Amino acid sequence: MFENITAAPADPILGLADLFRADERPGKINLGIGFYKDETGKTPVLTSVKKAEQYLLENETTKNYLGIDGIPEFGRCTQELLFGKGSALINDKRARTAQTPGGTGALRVAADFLAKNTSVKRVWVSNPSWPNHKSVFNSAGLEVREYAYYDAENHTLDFDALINSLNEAQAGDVVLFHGCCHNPTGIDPTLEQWQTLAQLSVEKGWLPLFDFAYQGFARGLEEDAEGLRAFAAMHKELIVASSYSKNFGLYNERVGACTLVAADSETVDRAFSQMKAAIRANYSNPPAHGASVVATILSNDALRAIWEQELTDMRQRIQRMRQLFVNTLQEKGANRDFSFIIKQNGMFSFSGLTKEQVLRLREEFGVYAVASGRVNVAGMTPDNMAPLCEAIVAVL
Amino acid sequence: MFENITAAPADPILGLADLFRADERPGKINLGIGFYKDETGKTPVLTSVKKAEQYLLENETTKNYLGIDGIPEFGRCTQELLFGKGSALINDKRARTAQTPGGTGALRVAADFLAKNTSVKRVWVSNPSWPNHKSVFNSAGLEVREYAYYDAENHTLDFDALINSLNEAQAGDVVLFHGCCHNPTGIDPTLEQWQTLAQLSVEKGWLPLFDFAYQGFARGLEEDAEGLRAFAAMHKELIVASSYSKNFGLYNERVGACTLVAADSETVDRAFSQMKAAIRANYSNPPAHGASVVATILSNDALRAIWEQELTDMRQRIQRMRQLFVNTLQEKGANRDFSFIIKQNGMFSFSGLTKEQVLRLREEFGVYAVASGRVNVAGMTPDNMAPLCEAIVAVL
Numbered sequence A, B: 001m002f003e004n005i006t007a008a009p010a011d012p013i014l015g016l017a018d019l020f021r022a023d024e025r026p027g028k029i030n031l032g033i034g035f036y037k038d039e040t041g042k043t044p045v046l047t048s049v050k051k052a053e054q055y056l057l058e059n060e061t062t063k064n065y066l067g068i069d070g071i072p073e074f075g076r077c078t079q080e081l082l083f084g085k086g087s088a089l090i091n092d093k094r095a096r097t098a099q100t101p102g103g104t105g106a107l108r109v110a111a112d113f114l115a116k117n118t119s120v121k122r123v124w125v126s127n128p129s130w131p132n133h134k135s136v137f138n139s140a141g142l143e144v145r146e147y148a149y150y151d152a153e154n155h156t157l158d159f160d161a162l163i164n165s166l167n168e169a170q171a172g173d174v175v176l177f178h179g180c181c182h183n184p185t186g187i188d189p190t191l192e193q194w195q196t197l198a199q200l201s202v203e204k205g206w207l208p209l210f211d212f213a214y215q216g217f218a219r220g221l222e223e224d225a226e227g228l229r230a231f232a233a234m235h236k237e238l239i240v241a242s243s244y245s246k247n248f249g250l251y252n253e254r255v256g257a258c259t260l261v262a263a264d265s266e267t268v269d270r271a272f273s274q275m276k277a278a279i280r281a282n283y284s285n286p287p288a289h290g291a292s293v294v295a296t297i298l299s300n301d302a303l304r305a306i307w308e309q310e311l312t313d314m315r316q317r318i319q320r321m322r323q324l325f326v327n328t329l330q331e332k333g334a335n336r337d338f339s340f341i342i343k344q345n346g347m348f349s350f351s352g353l354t355k356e357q358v359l360r361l362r363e364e365f366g367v368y369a370v371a372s373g374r375v376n377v378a379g380m381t382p383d384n385m386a387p388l389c390e391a392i393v394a395v396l
């Protein structure tokens, strides 16, 4: 009986959405979105995906079940994007890939698999990290611990506090890493720091799990993958949960993958069978549509070329707005220095505003931001930059 | 580390698939499929869904995330199909619906929700039942117990052994019911038996969970729902996991729903919030495509009319083959009586063949059936009926 069931907490982000929609003030700006938006303030379906879809419409002859691990080409294509077209992991057949319901579904199947087939008890999440991370791992029965990441003073990665924090993790603990475009600081380890991280991980015996949801949004498709690749060249085992929601704009089609890398082919195949058992007891097999779309774009020269151009366009816009933001705030005049905004990657970053300030920005100006000061750079258009920066200057 | 991970058992059904494909004998017949096939032996994408898809292609402007519970029209449309267009459950707002990744995903979210938000410890599954039932419930941490169902001698429902078995279930135990087209016996309770079941359930305090994957395949869309409706008119609470994989032929698009019915609006909303928290920690939000397709067909008169005709066509074919099977076996002459085949519903039923017989049917004749004697009626075409019935007669 559910007569005494207690209501789940209203998730903060969902809340802002309803408060903003109900905001009668015509000059309102929503910077707590979580999705990409163009200069127009819209999240269109990519031209390359629309072409891929017309194609599927013309050529699909059946809607019959996919295998537990999804469409094969899709799996192969993602392994190449993650590790490189000619990696030893691919040639030596050390990795297996399951197509899953988004990047979140990939984290939950990893979690379920880890929980029932291994002795892992804790997962180390960065502080701060994407809030749903904790909920996924806790739901599978794993304990979540946090390692230090952000440096509130300097707006940077506290690498000392980072390596110092992880010394509390024992061999066999999983350590969660954001491949690029750290949600929500936008702060990423540099290559030197990734190599230092990869080496230390091997030494202490961490099981690295990578959350790779923004490949292509920081510097490029291959550039963004070198941190993961620095760990892959050094570990016998690792798991990578990837998403295509943002880089393909396929949010609601739920397309991602869970990649298991083992010491060798024989062992990865044996572990993957248990990962497939984990999937069968959850959703059975994955949704074909969005994954089919990804597989036909990546497998076609013309379509892939158009998609890559559409991805660089999004990446550049997000980089344009970070610059515009920093200096439009300067032209508004105030002891500040939001220049650190320029060094961060992706759509998110902490503005450095207090909850005191974020609250009045909203009530007094109708500029919506997350209580943590998180601001989505894609919510900014060259049109709303001045009226945005003026609101920020007034609360400083 | 996965170096000592033990391989998951090869799932029997997956096995036959590979043995059949590798069967060089040109007269091979596969009756252990699990999906629908037309007279041609193909599983085409319905004409109504193809139209729905061209429409979505022309009119979709964004692929941005759906809410945790899915597309609203989709939810409303399923509540109407399940309980009737003017039910008190709908008018009194006692039910809430989440769009999920297939009927299997609906069972796993029900399981997760039940496991963390209530005191349910066991789930009662029929004997036999769909094998993945046990895996879903066990994965959420629930215990699975079995109540008697089939009567191997008479090829019927042992209703005595049924009511007698359930007396071992205490108030607070969940009891799983197949809405129609029981997988795999095809044997369903009659209305009188459903009312007796609904009444006894209330009395002992069972939490009924309905697995409704074949609405429309037994007698009709509304006819098939009266068993569930006999429980709904009598219970304050219940859960229904429905699938659109088979009745819409949307297998790989993963479209189903999990419907929570509570005593009143206030309580269903409070419990549903926890059901949404269960979804957020699993896959986040659901896949739009297949559900969008279902919502546009059901919401449109023309398209819905075509779909219903396509569904009755499948239902009638499956009913044609059950007749053809029974008497083509008679024309082959043998002390038998597969007439019980005519009283069973859906694509499946137990042929009454022993594993001894199913094994030689396969090795000697290349007729593939499940070791339990389960046979998919949709694997039969008027063309393969004679060479099928002759193989069966020869092993009898």
Ligand SMILES: *Cc1c(COP(=O)(O)O)cnc(C)c1O
Pocket: A101, A102, A103, A104, A105, A130, A178, A183, A211, A213, A243, A244, A245, A251, A254, A255, A256, B283, B284
């Ligand atoms: C957006 C996001 C995800 C989710 O991916 P989905 O494909 O939407 O489920 C996972 N991890 C991080 C860090 C994300 O920001």
Ligand SMILES: *Cc1c(COP(=O)(O)O)cnc(C)c1O
Pocket: A283, A284, B101, B102, B103, B104, B105, B130, B178, B183, B211, B213, B243, B244, B245, B251, B254, B255, B256
């Ligand atoms: C086919 C089936 C399901 C699965 O539905 P999906 O939509 O494929 O996940 C669930 N229960 C029963 C009894 C089924 O036969």
